[PDB]
Amino acid sequence: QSMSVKGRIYSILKQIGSGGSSKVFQVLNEKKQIYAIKYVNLEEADNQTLDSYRNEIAYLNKLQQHSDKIIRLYDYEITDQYIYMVMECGNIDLNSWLKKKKSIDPWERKSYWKNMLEAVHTIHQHGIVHSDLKPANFLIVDGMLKLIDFGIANQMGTVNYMPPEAIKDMSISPKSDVWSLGCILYYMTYGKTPFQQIINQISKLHAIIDPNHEIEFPDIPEKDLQDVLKCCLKRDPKQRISIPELLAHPYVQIQ
Ligand SMILES: Cn1cc(-c2c[nH]c(=O)c(N)c2)cn1
């Protein structure tokens, strides 16, 4: 019902999420202000697992100064036992917002799409590739989208956003993140994932790999959006659109 971080006393409002070792809480400070505290319990965590959390914190602290589209981290407490991260509190996650919403206004969709490329572009500049991108790594705060996960540590489980190169890499580049964002935008346009209809997961993996499989892009009034979707969802990483290219596309730029 209460926890301390760097002397500061935060009273727990509710629990948002959990990822086994982790637990996220909606808390309030002394002045009734809202924050979200991530709690990690290192008691049973391994040497490799600890450096993944040590790495994610470092980047999440550095990269905060490089984009308003990356989740704010106000403070943190690290000991051998736990990790207390005091971050900004969002309205709702993108996955929950999309699963709820029936309609998606073109002006909102385009705005969110710009927020994502800005975050994803920031991380790529510091040599980070997320790889596992899903609407859950995004969070609506002050009507603006923000990146919570850098895909470094363990996230607090849909196969609908997997890049083809990843499935074929069983025997990862920035183009892997383009495919995944392409799938989040497609689902923001057509209401469903590109391979969301393929019930069997073994077969769903067969589809993403197979080039003789044609992905559907129904005729939309937003001409540029359909071209964005056709460029992001190119199976060959070499022939796929880049993040600096998407940022200079007519979809993002033309008003
Ligand atoms: C890195 N990380 C940020 C969060 C988080 C921060 N703020 C929130 O509002 C939320 N739902 C989640 C969880 N993990």
For the chain, what are the domain ranges? 3-91, 92-255
Header resolution in angstroms = 3.0
Residue among 247, 222, 254 nearest 232 (CA):
247
Collapsed DSSP state (helix, strand, coil) of residue 25: strand
**Can you name the CATH fold of 3-91?**
Phosphorylase Kinase; domain 1 (3.30.200)
Q: Does any ligand 1 atom lie closer than 6 A to the CB of residue 156?
A: yes
Residue among 183, 212, 223 nearest 95 (CA):
183
Q: Does any ligand 1 atom lie closer than 6 A to the CB of residue 90?
A: yes
DSSP 86: E
On the question of a common fold for 3-91 and 92-255, the answer reads no
- Which option is the CATH number for 92-255: 1.10.510.10, 1.10.3430.10, 1.20.1090.10, 1.10.569.10? 1.10.510.10
Collapsed DSSP state (helix, strand, coil) of residue 39: strand
Q: Does any ligand 1 atom lie closer than 6 A to the CB of residue 37?
A: no
- Considering the candidates 51, 75, 80, 132, report the single residue annotated as catalytic: 132
Taking the centre of ligand 1 as the mean of its atom positions, its distance from the CA of residue 130, in whole angstroms, is 16
> Which amino acid would we find at residue 28?
L
Residue among 235, 18, 255, 253 nearest 114 (CA):
253
Q: Where are the alpha helices (DSSP H) in the chain?
A: 47-62, 94-100, 106-125, 164-168, 174-189, 201-209, 223-232, 243-246, 250-253
Q: Which residues does the annotation place in the binding site for ATP?
A: 16-24, 38
Residue 90 token pair: 């969002």
Q: Does any ligand 1 atom lie closer than 6 A to the CB of residue 70?
A: no
Largest CA distance in the chain: 60
DSSP 211: T
CA angle, 20 then 14 then 36, to 5°: 75
Residue 133 token pair: 């991108």
Q: Does any ligand 1 atom lie closer than 6 A to the CB of residue 120?
A: no
> Which amino acid would we find at residue 196?
Q
Collapsed DSSP state (helix, strand, coil) of residue 181: helix
Where does residue 138 rank: exposed (0-12), middle (13-18), buried (19+ CB within 10 A)?
Answer: buried
Integer Cα distance of 200 and 244 in angstroms = 35
Is the Cβ–Cβ distance between 192 and 145 less than 8 Å?
Answer: no
Q: Which residue has the least CA distance to atom 1 on ligand 1? A: 148
Q: Let me know if 93 is a catalytic residue.
A: no
Where does residue 236 rank: exposed (0-12), middle (13-18), buried (19+ CB within 10 A)?
Answer: exposed
Taking the centre of ligand 1 as the mean of its atom positions, its distance from the CA of residue 106, in whole angstroms, is 26
Q: Which residues does the annotation place in the binding site?
A: 16-24, 38
Taking the centre of ligand 1 as the mean of its atom positions, its distance from the CA of residue 124, in whole angstroms, is 21
Neighbours of 233 (CB within 10 A): 19
Alpha-carbon distances of 180 from 4, 43, 131, 136, 162, rounded to whole Å: 38, 34, 8, 12, 7
List CB contacts of 132: < 8 A, sequence separation 6 or more: 151, 155, 161, 180
**CA 45 to mean position of chain CA atoms:** 24
Taking the centre of ligand 1 as the mean of its atom positions, its distance from the CA of residue 13, in whole angstroms, is 15
Sign of the dihedral defined by the CA atoms of residues 90, 225, 117, 239, in that order = positive
Phi, psi (deg, nearest 5) at residue 80: -80, -20
Residue 245 token pair: 């290219």
> Which amino acid would we find at residue 97?
W
Elucidation technique:
X-ray
Residue 252 token pair: 């993002």
Q: Where are the alpha helices (DSSP H) in 6-159?
A: 47-62, 94-100, 106-125
